[PDB]
Design an enzyme around this catalytic site. Structure first.
Site, PDB file in Angstrom:
ATOM      1  N   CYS A 168       0.796   2.087  -5.594  1.00  0.00           N
ATOM      2  CA  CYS A 168      -0.043   2.994  -6.374  1.00  0.00           C
ATOM      3  C   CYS A 168       0.497   4.423  -6.401  1.00  0.00           C
ATOM      4  CB  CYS A 168      -1.467   2.999  -5.829  1.00  0.00           C
ATOM      5  SG  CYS A 168      -2.309   1.408  -5.962  1.00  0.00           S
TER       6      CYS A 168
ATOM      7  N   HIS B 263       0.812  -1.213   0.000  1.00  0.00           N
ATOM      8  CA  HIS B 263       0.000   0.000   0.000  1.00  0.00           C
ATOM      9  C   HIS B 263       0.849   1.269   0.000  1.00  0.00           C
ATOM     10  CE1 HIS B 263      -4.025  -1.354  -0.050  1.00  0.00           C
ATOM     11  NE2 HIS B 263      -4.129  -1.757   1.204  1.00  0.00           N
TER      12      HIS B 263
ATOM     13  N   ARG C 166       0.756   3.099 -11.378  1.00  0.00           N
ATOM     14  CA  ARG C 166       1.626   2.376 -10.468  1.00  0.00           C
ATOM     15  C   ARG C 166       3.036   2.958 -10.477  1.00  0.00           C
ATOM     16  NH1 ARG C 166      -2.789   1.273  -9.592  1.00  0.00           N
ATOM     17  NH2 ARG C 166      -3.799  -0.786  -9.617  1.00  0.00           N
TER      18      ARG C 166
END
Length: 162
Positions: A131, A62, A140
């Site tokens: 991300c 994340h 990305r």
């Protein structure tokens, strides 16, 4: 696209004050939303493990929630250590290359010799994917490293972790 659930190693990135478990697979519910980083392991995206004498160890984490392990991987500079700790070994990688923005469909960055990395042939690599921009999943960001030390646990921590 990019992005059992059993935790099998620890990832250390000393510059970023990151210590975070690696689990098998990149499920949001079972892995990333549990604050772990995920080893690409299904749907043809399965990558090599670090103990293989060649391969690309691919990981997803994340950018912005649940401990946000990869929030600042764009602050890595060439030579900055990335350490994978397993039961038996320490694998020390150093940051080599960065692709700050790419399409989430660009899975070739996880190839054994990752596309767009600038790596010329077979070696022992690591790929970190997250991300970008922050708080979105539009594109990305990819960071690559190259192995510099394979260290038996019986030898204690590598220099990078002290």
């Amino acid at each position: 696209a990019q992005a059992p659930g059993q935790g099998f190693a620890l990832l250390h990135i000393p510059k970023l004050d990151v210590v975070v478990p690696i689990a098998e697979g990149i499920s949001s519910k079972k892995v990333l939303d549990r604050g772990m980083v995920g080893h690409y392991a299904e749907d043809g995206l399965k990558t090599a493990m670090p103990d293989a004498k060649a391969g690309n160890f691919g990981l997803a984490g994340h950018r912005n929630t649940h401990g946000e392990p990869f929030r600042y991987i764009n602050k890595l500079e060439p030579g900055d250590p990335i350490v994978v700790e397993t039961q038996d070994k320490y694998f020390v990688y150093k940051m080599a290359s960065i692709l700050p923005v790419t399409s989430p469909s660009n899975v070739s960055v996880l190839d054994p010799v990752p596309k767009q990395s600038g790596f010329k042939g077979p070696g022992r690599y690591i790929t970190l994917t997250t991300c970008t921009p922050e708080f979105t999943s539009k594109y990305r960001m990819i960071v690559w490293g190259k192995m510099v030390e394979e260290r038996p646990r019986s030898k204690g921590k590598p220099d990078a972790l002290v």
